[PDB]
C-alpha cells in the first residue's frame, strides 16, 4: 500500500 | 482582375531514404516554403509531400522510476546500453542514448517527513538503506558509448517515499524542455521512454504538499542535474506536457509494468501520439518495446498547423495509398518507414484583414521539417442571410472548420475515428464529423458494429492469397501491403495451441484447400499461420 504493498 | 498567387519560394527535395545527410542536409518535406498573396475572399490550392526517410538517426532518453517498488525490476537494465543498441541498429546508423531517474517531490506528505531525523536516508523503518528520495535527477546525457551507458545504469538503485502515485510527469516535462542538458539533436527521431511501477501524480495533487503554483513548462534543471523547482511548483498537466511534447518534437513511450498498463493506455488516449509498452517477464526490460514502439510511432503521418491567422481556413485531401486521394483528411496511417505521402492544402481568407508577414508552419508531427507559408493580402437592423450556426452575412460565409450552406457541416474527422484508429472502422465515410456507413450490413457510431458481417476467415483469406500466393484481388490492386499488414507465417504443417483464436479453411483458385489461423497475443499482435502444404487433389 503506497510505495510498496 | 485579381492576382492571387502562391509562388513556391523554396524547394530542397525529399532525400531518398538517406538516413545520414553527408553534406546532403536531410529533408522530409518537399515544399520547404511557399508564399501566398490573397484577394479578399479567395483561395489558392497547393501541396506538400512528406517522407519517412530511411535510417533516420534516433535519440532515446530513459526516464526511470527509482522509488522503492521498482526494486524487483532493475539490474538487467544493463540491457539498455546493449539491448537498445542492437535491436535498434537494424533501423539506424546513429543512435544516441541517455537516461535520468525520478522518485517524487521531496516534501511534506510525499517525502519521508523526518520521522526519526535518522531517516533522510529512507526505508530504515524496515532496513535496506535505500538512499534519499530526489524528485528528478539527470544522470547521463545522450551519447554514443553504450558501454559507458551499460555501467552508470547499473550503479542506480531504488530510493523510497510513501505515496503510491509517483509524479515523474515532472520528469517527462523537464526531460522535454531541457534540450541543452539532455542533448536533443534537432535532426534525429526523439524518443522518451517512461518506465514505471505504478500510479502517478497529475496536476493539482501538490496542493496537499502546500504547493499552489502551476508548472511553467520552463526548464529548471541546472548544474547539480536536479529539478530545482521540484519542491516549489506543482506537477505539469496533460495539456502542458502535450504542448511541450509536441513543440520539442519528442515522443513519449510508456514502458510500464502489467498491473498498471490500461492506466497508461487510457492516459495515452489523451496525449495523442503516445504509445504504451508492457515491461513484464522478469523485469529490467522485455521485447524492446522501443523498437516495436518507434515502429508504431512512425506508422502514421499527421499534419499539424502552427500559427495560422484567424481569417484563412485550410481544407485538406490526403492521397495516402498510391494516388487514391482521400478527401477531407490530413493524416495517413499504416505506413512503413520509407513510404512517401502527399496532402493538398487549400488556404483561404474571408475578406482580407490587415497586412503583415503573418507566416505560419504546417508540419508532420514528430519532425523538424516544416513547410512555412508567408501570407499577404491584396485589398489595396436585420440581415436575412442567416438561419444561424456560424453563418455570417452578405449571404452565409462559414468560419474556419465549418462548411455547408447553413454552415452546420464540420471539417472535423476526429469524431469519426475508431478504436483501431481507422476512419469509421473502414466501412464508411466521415460526413460532417459523422460516419454514414457504406453498409455491408453495419451501423454504429463509427460503423464499428456489424454482427452480420462475414467471419474474419474471409477478410484474412484475401491476405494469404496475396502475401503467400501472390494471386488475389488485394494484389491486383497493388494495395496488399499498407492495406494488409498483419504478419503471416507459414506454420510447420501443424496447427498452433493458443485456444483463444480461430482457425480457417478454404479453397484457392487452384482447387486446393488452404488452412490458416488468426491470432492476437499482447501488443494486440496480429499473426497468421498458414499450413505449409495445402491438401490438393492427388493422382
Amino acid at each position: 500500500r503506497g510505495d510498496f504493498v | 482582375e485579381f492576382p492571387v498567387s502562391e509562388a513556391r519560394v523554396l524547394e530542397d527535395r525529399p532525400l531518398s531514404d538517406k538516413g545520414s545527410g553527408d553534406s546532403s542536409q536531410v529533408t522530409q518535406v518537399s515544399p520547404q516554403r511557399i508564399a501566398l498573396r490573397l484577394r479578399p475572399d479567395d483561395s489558392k490550392n497547393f501541396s506538400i509531400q512528406v517522407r519517412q526517410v530511411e535510417d533516420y538517426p534516433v535519440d532515446i532518453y530513459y526516464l526511470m522510476d527509482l522509488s522503492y517498488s521498482m526494486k524487483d525490476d532493475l539490474w538487467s537494465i544493463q540491457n539498455l546500453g546493449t539491448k537498445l543498441a542492437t535491436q535498434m541498429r537494424k533501423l539506424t546508423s546513429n543512435l544516441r542514448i541517455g537516461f535520468g531517474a525520478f522518485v517524487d517531490k521531496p516534501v511534506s506528505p510525499y517525502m519521508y517527513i523526518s520521522p526519526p531525523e535518522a531517516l533522510e536516508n529512507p526505508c530504515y523503518d524496515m532496513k535496506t538503506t535505500c538512499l534519499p528520495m530526489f524528485g528528478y535527477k539527470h544522470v547521463l546525457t545522450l551519447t554514443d558509448q553504450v558501454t559507458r551507458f551499460n555501467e552508470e545504469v547499473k550503479k542506480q538503485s531504488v530510493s523510497r517515499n510513501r505515496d503510491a502515485p509517483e509524479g515523474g510527469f515532472d520528469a517527462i516535462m523537464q526531460a522535454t524542455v531541457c534540450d541543452e542538458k539532455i542533448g536533443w539533436r534537432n535532426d534525429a527521431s526523439h524518443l522518451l521512454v517512461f518506465t514505471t511501477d505504478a500510479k502517478t501524480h497529475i496536476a493539482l495533487d501538490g496542493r496537499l504538499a502546500g504547493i499552489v503554483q502551476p508548472n511553467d513548462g520552463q526548464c529548471h534543471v541546472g548544474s547539480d542535474n536536479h529539478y530545482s523547482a521540484s519542491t516549489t511548483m506543482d506537477y505539469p498537466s496533460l495539456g502542458l506536457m502535450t504542448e511541450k511534447l509536441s513543440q520539442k518534437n519528442i515522443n513519449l513511450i510508456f514502458a510500464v509494468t502489467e498491473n498498471v498498463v490500461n492506466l497508461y493506455q487510457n492516459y495515452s488516449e489523451l496525449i495523442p501520439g503516445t504509445t504504451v509498452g508492457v515491461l513484464s517477464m522478469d523485469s529490467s526490460n522485455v521485447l524492446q518495446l522501443i523498437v516495436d514502439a518507434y515502429g508504431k510511432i512512425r506508422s502514421k503521418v499527421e499534419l499539424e498547423v502552427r500559427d495560422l491567422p484567424e481569417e484563412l481556413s485550410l481544407s485538406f485531401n490526403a492521397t495516402c495509398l498510391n494516388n487514391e486521394v482521400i478527401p477531407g483528411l490530413k493524416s495517413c496511417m499504416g505506413l512503413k518507414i520509407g513510404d512517401t505521402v502527399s496532402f493538398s492544402i487549400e488556404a483561404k481568407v474571408r475578406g482580407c484583414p490587415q497586412e503583415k508577414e503573418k507566416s505560419f508552419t504546417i508540419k508532420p508531427v514528430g519532425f523538424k521539417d516544416s513547410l512555412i507559408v508567408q501570407v499577404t493580402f491584396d485589398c489595396d437592423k436585420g440581415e436575412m442571410c442567416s438561419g444561424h450556426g456560424q453563418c455570417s452575412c452578405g449571404d452565409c460565409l462559414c468560419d474556419s472548420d465549418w462548411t455547408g450552406y447553413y454552415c452546420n457541416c464540420t471539417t472535423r474527422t476526429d469524431t469519426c475515428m475508431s478504436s483501431n484508429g481507422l476512419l469509421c472502422s473502414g466501412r464508411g465515410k466521415c460526413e460532417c464529423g459523422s460516419c454514414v456507413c457504406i453498409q455491408p450490413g453495419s451501423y454504429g457510431d463509427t460503423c464499428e458494429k456489424c454482427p452480420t458481417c462475414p467471419d474474419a476467415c474471409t477478410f484474412k483469406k484475401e491476405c494469404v492469397e496475396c502475401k503467400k500466393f501472390d494471386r488475389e484481388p488485394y494484389m491486383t490492386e497493388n494495395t496488399c501491403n499498407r492495406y494488409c499488414r498483419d504478419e503471416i507465417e507459414s506454420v510447420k504443417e501443424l496447427k498452433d495451441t493458443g485456444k483463444d483464436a480461430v482457425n480457417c479453411t478454404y479453397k484457392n483458385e487452384d482447387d486446393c484447400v488452404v488452412r490458416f489461423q488468426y491470432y492476437e497475443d499482447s501488443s494486440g499482435k496480429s499473426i497468421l499461420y498458414v499450413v505449409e502444404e495445402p491438401e490438393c487433389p492427388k493422382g
Binding site: - | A164, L208, E535
Partner: protein, 927 residues
C-alpha cells in the same frame, strides 16, 4: 448581471503571505455591522519559534479597509518530553480554510504536523480552531491514537470545511488511510463542550465520519472539496464532497447523509486527470427550492473548433429533480490554461430577480493571467450558460500568478442596498476584493402620437413663426420606473424624441417640432414609485406638402432615454442600473393620409391562403416542410401588414425560400415572445390595395409523440388599421404518418465446411463438440431503420434439424441481444453436450425435420436491432462416401419476422413482414 467594477473595496496584506487564499463574511449576531475574513497562510506570527504559522485576518468594511489578525493560538509548540516537541506549527498553513457561521468561526491549518504519542514522528494530521468572541477551542478530529499512513496520520483534516444549517461542521481530510480521504462531521457545541486542553485526542459523542475502505480506493483524496445541502428526502444538510482522484484519475463527487453519514449519490468525471471535484458547491439555482450540484474540473479538455484537445476547464451543473435523481449539463471555459472550474462561488440573487446566482472563476485566465470571474444567472429553466458579467483581475505578478479568483465568497449584502456582494481573493499578489452589488431598476417606456394617420390638407394648428394652419399632430411620452432595495425616491431621466427617422442623412425630416422647428427635441424628467408614471407631450407638425414627396414611408417617432448618476447611497455613491434586458427605446409611427379617400379611412380586405404541398410527415426524424402562403389585400391600404404564422412545439423556422423564382422573399422573423411561437412577416408596411404575395415558409417538425393524428399551423394577417384590421384566421394541419423500414439480416460463421474433416473420430456415445464436429453458427438480426418505431413484432426461425432420422447441424444453445425472448419447439441440446474438455444439395425445412424457434419481440426504435445467436455443431454424419454421390449439401436455415404493433394508436398502419435464409455448405473438400 451588475456589480460595481469602478470602486470595489480593495484589501491587501504582507508579501509572500498568500493574503486571500481563503475568504469569508463575518456577520456577528451581537453587532449591527459585518466584516471580511481573509485567510493568509504563510503569514508570520508572533508565536514563539513558529515560522509561517498563518493567520486569518478580520477586515473592516468600515471603508477603513484595515485588516488586523484574529487571535487564535498564540503559544508555539507543546512538548512530549524535554527537547522532543509534540507538535510543529511552523509552516502549518493556518488560514488555508475559513468558515464563519454567526459569531463562531472555524479556521484550519491543514499542513499542521504532529509527532505521534508513540515513536518520534512528524505526521500532517492537520488541526483547526473554533472561536466565539472570546471562548476558543481547538478542533483536530484527525489527531488520534489511530496513527500512521494507514489511519489518520496524513489526514490533513481541515483541508476543506463547512457549517451545516443546524450548526454542525463538515470537515474534510484527503490523506486519511492511504490518501483515500475522509469526511468528519461533528456538531458544534459538542466540539466546544468536550474541549479539554489536556487531551490531545478528544472523543466526540455524535460524531459522523467516513471510515477506511478497500485498498483499491487509495489515493482518491476524498475531502479535497466540501459543500453541503439537502439531497435526501428532507431534513437538514447532507454532505457533498469532491474526490478528484477517484475512479483512476477520472474523479468523482460523493454525496452523504447528514444523519447516518451513509452514501446518497455519486458523480463521476468523464475525462481523466481533469480534476473533477477540485471544487464543489451546492445551491438552488432555479427557485424550485432544491439544491443543485456544481462540480469543477479546471483541467478538462474539450475539442476546439479544429477538433484538437484543449485544456480549458469544465463545470458540471446537476439540477436536482423531484424524483431524487438529477438532470446534468456541462459548461466549458473560454481560454486555455485558464482553469475555468477552479472556484464555484454561489452569490445571493445578485439582481433580486427571484432566482439564485453563482460565479465560476478561471483564476489564471485573462490577459497576463490576471484572472477572470464569470458571473452567471439563474432562471426558471435552470442556469443561463452565458457569463452575465466578467470581473477581471488588475494586479501585476511579482513572483507567481495573482491567481485572482482562486477563492471567493458571496451571499451576504455587506451593506445598505438589498443586494448580495462578493469577495474575490488573489493570493499571488496578497489581496482580496469586495465587489458591491448595484441596485437594479426596471423602467417602462411610453410613446403614442395622437393623430396616427396625419392629414396633409388638415389645417388644425397655428404655426409659431407665422400664424398658419399646418397639419397638426401631438406626441406624448410617458415613463414609469420601478426599483428594488435602496435607490427610489429621486429618479432623474434624459428622454429624447426623433421625428421621421427613416430619413438618414438625406434630411427629408418630414415631421418637425412646433416651438422649435426641428425633428430632434430633447427633455429632462423625473419620477420615483414603481407605479408612478409622470408624463409629458409635444406638438409636431407636417411641413407643407409642397416641400417634400413620400407616397408614404411611415413617419416613425423614436423615443430613447437615459438615467444619470448621483442617484444612490452615501457610501461611495452606488449608482443603480436598468435591468439586463430592458430596451432603452420605443418607436411608434405615423402614416400620411393617402389613397384612403372619401370613405376617408383605409379599410383593407386581408386574406390568408395556404396549400397541402407534401401532405404528410413520418414519425421520428426532422421532416422538411414548406408552407406555400398567399397574402392578399383587396380593400384599401393596410398599414404595418404582417403575416403571423403560429407554429406548434414540434415545429421550427428555418427561413423563407430564395431557391425559387415564383416565391417572394418576405422579411420573416421567428419570434416566440409570449407563450406562443410565431413567424411574423413584413407584408410591406403600407401593403397597397390589390397587393398579392406568394412565399414559402420552411419548417421542420420532430413530433410530440403519439400526439393525435396531426400537427397544425395557424395563419392570419394583421395591420395597424382602425377598421377591418385583420384577415380571417386560417388553420393548416398536416397528418403524421408511420414508416418503419424494419429488415432481417442473417449470416453463417463457417459459411462453408470442407468434409474431409481434420482428425475426427466416430464415437458410440459422444460427449463433446470435438467428438461431434465443427461449430456452425448462424446470426440473425432484426433491425428497425424506418424513422417510426414499433412496439411488438414476431420473429420466426426454421432450422434444418434432421434428414431421414439423422441429425445434421445440432443446436447446442442460443443467445439473444436486444428486446426479445425466444422459444424452441424442441429441447435444445438433448444429450447435454458441453463445451471443451481434456434434396440434391439444399436441405431446407421443406425437405427436412424442423427445429423451429419462435421469438417474441417488442420495441426497436429508430436505429436499434435485435439479434439471435444460434450455436450448433455439424454432426459430421453428413457422411455417406460408400454409395452414390454424397458429395454436396447446403444446410439451410431461415428466419422470418412479422411486425405486429406500434405505439401510435389512431394512426394508419400496415403490417411489416419479410424473411431471409442463411446457408452453410458442407462439401467433400478434395472428394
Amino acid at each position: 448581471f451588475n456589480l460595481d467594477v469602478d470602486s470595489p473595496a480593495e484589501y491587501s496584506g504582507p508579501e509572500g503571505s498568500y493574503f486571500g487564499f481563503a475568504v469569508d463574511f463575518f456577520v456577528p449576531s451581537a453587532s449591527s455591522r459585518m466584516f471580511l475574513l481573509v485567510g493568509a497562510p504563510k503569514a508570520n506570527t508572533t508565536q514563539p519559534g513558529i515560522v509561517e504559522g498563518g493567520q486569518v485576518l478580520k477586515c473592516d468594511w468600515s471603508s477603513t479597509r484595515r485588516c488586523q489578525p484574529i487571535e487564535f493560538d498564540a503559544t508555539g509548540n507543546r512538548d512530549y518530553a524535554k527537547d522532543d516537541p509534540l507538535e510543529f506549527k511552523s509552516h502549518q498553513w493556518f488560514g488555508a480554510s475559513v468558515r464563519s457561521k454567526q459569531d463562531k468561526i472555524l479556521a484550519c491549518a491543514p499542513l499542521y504536523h504532529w509527532r505521534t504519542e508513540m515513536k518520534q514522528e512528524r505526521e500532517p494530521v492537520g488541526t483547526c480552531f473554533l472561536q466565539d468572541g472570546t471562548k476558543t477551542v481547538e478542533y483536530a478530529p484527525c489527531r488520534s491514537q489511530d496513527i500512521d499512513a494507514d489511519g489518520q496520520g496524513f489526514c490533513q483534516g481541515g483541508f476543506s470545511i463547512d457549517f451545516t444549517k443546524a450548526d454542525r461542521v463538515l470537515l474534510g481530510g484527503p490523506g486519511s488511510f492511504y490518501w483515500q480521504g475522509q469526511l468528519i462531521s461533528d456538531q458544534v457545541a459538542e466540539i466546544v463542550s468536550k474541549y479539554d486542553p489536556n487531551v490531545y485526542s478528544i472523543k466526540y459523542n455524535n460524531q459522523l465520519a467516513t471510515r477506511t475502505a478497500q485498498a483499491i480506493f487509495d489515493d482518491s483524496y476524498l475531502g479535497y472539496s466540501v459543500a453541503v445541502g439537502d439531497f435526501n428526502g428532507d431534513g437538514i444538510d447532507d454532505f457533498v464532497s469532491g474526490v478528484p482522484r477517484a475512479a483512476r484519475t477520472l474523479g468523482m463527487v460523493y454525496i452523504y447523509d447528514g444523519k447516518n453519514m451513509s452514501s446518497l449519490y455519486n458523480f463521476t468525471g468523464e475525462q481523466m486527470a481533469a480534476y473533477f471535484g477540485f471544487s464543489v458547491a451546492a445551491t438552488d439555482i432555479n427557485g424550485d427550492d432544491y439544491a443543485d450540484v456544481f462540480i469543477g474540473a479546471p483541467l478538462f479538455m474539450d475539442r476546439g473548433s479544429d477538433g484538437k484537445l484543449q485544456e480549458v476547464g469544465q463545470v458540471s451543473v446537476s439540477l436536482q429533480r423531484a424524483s431524487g435523481d438529477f438532470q446534468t449539463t456541462k459548461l466549458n471555459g473560454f481560454e486555455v490554461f485558464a482553469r475555468f472550474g477552479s472556484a464555484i462561488a454561489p452569490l445571493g440573487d445578485l439582481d433580486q430577480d427571484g432566482f439564485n446566482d453563482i460565479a465560476i472563476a478561471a483564476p489564471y485566465g485573462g490577459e497576463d493571467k490576471k484572472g477572470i470571474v464569470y458571473i452567471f444567472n439563474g432562471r426558471s429553466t435552470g442556469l443561463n450558460a452565458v457569463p452575465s458579467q466578467i470581473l477581471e483581475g488588475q494586479w501585476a505578478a511579482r513572483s507567481m500568478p495573482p491567481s485572482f479568483g482562486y477563492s471567493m465568497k458571496g451571499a451576504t449584502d455587506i451593506d445598505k442596498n438589498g443586494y448580495p456582494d462578493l469577495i474575490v481573493g488573489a493570493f499571488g499578489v496578497d489581496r482580496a476584493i469586495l465587489y458591491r452589488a448595484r441596485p437594479v431598476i426596471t423602467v417602462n417606456a411610453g410613446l403614442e402620437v395622437y393623430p396616427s394617420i396625419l392629414n396633409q390638407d388638415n389645417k388644425t394648428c397655428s404655426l409659431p413663426g407665422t400664424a398658419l394652419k399646418v397639419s397638426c399632430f401631438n406626441v406624448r411620452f410617458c415613463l414609469k420606473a420601478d426599483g428594488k432595495g435602496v435607490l427610489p425616491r429621486k429618479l432623474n431621466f434624459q428622454v429624447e424624441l426623433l421625428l421621421d427617422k427613416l430619413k438618414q442623412k438625406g434630411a427629408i425630416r418630414r415631421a418637425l417640432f412646433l416651438y422649435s422647428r426641428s425633428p430632434s427635441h430633447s427633455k429632462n424628467m423625473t419620477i420615483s414609485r414603481g407605479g408612478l408614471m409622470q408624463c409629458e407631450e409635444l406638438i409636431a407638425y407636417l411641413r407643407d406638402e409642397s416641400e417634400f414627396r413620400d407616397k408614404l414611408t411611415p413617419i416613425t417617432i423614436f423615443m430613447e432615454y437615459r438615467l444619470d448618476y448621483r442617484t444612490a447611497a452615501d457610501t461611495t455613491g452606488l449608482q443603480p442600473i436598468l435591468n439586463q434586458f430592458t430596451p432603452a427605446n420605443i418607436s411608434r409611427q405615423a402614416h400620411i393620409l393617402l389613397d384612403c379617400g372619401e370613405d376617408n379611412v383605409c379599410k383593407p380586405k386581408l386574406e390568408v391562403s395556404v396549400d397541402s404541398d407534401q401532405k404528410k410527415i413520418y414519425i421520428g426524424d426532422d421532416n422538411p416542410l414548406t408552407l406555400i402562403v398567399k397574402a392578399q389585400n383587396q380593400g384599401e391600404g393596410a398599414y404595418e401588414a404582417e403575416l403571423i404564422v403560429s407554429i406548434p412545439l414540434q415545429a421550427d423556422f428555418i427561413g423563407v425560400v430564395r431557391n425559387n423564382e415564383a416565391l417572394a422573399r418576405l422579411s420573416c422573423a421567428f419570434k416566440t415572445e409570449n407563450q406562443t411561437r410565431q413567424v411574423v412577416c413584413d407584408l410591406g408596411n403600407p401593403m397597397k390595395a390589390g397587393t398579392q404575395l406568394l412565399a414559402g415558409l420552411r419548417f421542420s417538425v420532430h413530433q410530440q409523440s403519439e400526439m393525435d393524428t396531426s400537427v397544425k399551423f395557424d395563419l392570419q394577417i394583421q395591420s395597424s388599421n382602425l377598421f377591418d384590421k385583420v384577415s380571417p384566421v386560417v388553420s393548416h394541419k398536416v397528418d403524421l404518418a408511420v414508416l418503419a423500414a424494419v429488415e432481417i439480416r442473417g449470416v453463417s460463421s463457417p459459411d462453408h465446411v470442407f468434409l474431409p474433416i481434420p482428425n475426427w473420430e466416430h464415437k458410440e456415445n459422444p460427449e463433446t463438440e470435438e467428438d461431434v464436429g465443427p461449430v456452425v453458427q448462424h446470426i440473425y438480426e432484426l433491425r428497425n431503420n424506418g424513422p417510426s418505431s414499433f412496439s411488438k413484432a414476431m420473429l420466426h426461425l426454421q432450422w434444418p434439424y434432421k434428414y431421414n432420422n439423422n441429425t445434421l447441424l445440432y443446436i447446442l444453445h442460443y443467445d439473444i441481444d436486444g428486446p426479445m425472448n425466444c422459444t424452441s419447439d424442441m429441447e435444445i441440446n438433448p444429450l447435454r453436450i458441453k463445451i471443451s474438455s481434456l434434396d440434391i444439395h439444399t436441405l431446407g425445412c421443406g425437405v427436412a425435420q424442423c427445429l423451429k424457434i419462435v421469438c417474441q419481440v417488442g420495441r426497436l426504435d429508430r436505429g436499434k436491432s435485435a439479434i439471435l445467436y444460434v450455436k450448433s455443431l455439424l454432426w459430421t454424419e453428413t457422411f455417406m462416401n460408400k454409395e452414390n454421390q454424397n458429395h454436396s449439401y447446403s444446410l439451410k436455415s431461415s428466419a422470418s419476422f412479422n411486425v405486429i404493433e406500434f405505439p401510435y394508436k389512431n394512426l394508419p398502419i400496415e403490417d411489416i413482414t419479410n424473411s431471409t435464409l442463411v446457408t452453410t455448405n458442407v462439401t467433400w473438400g478434395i472428394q
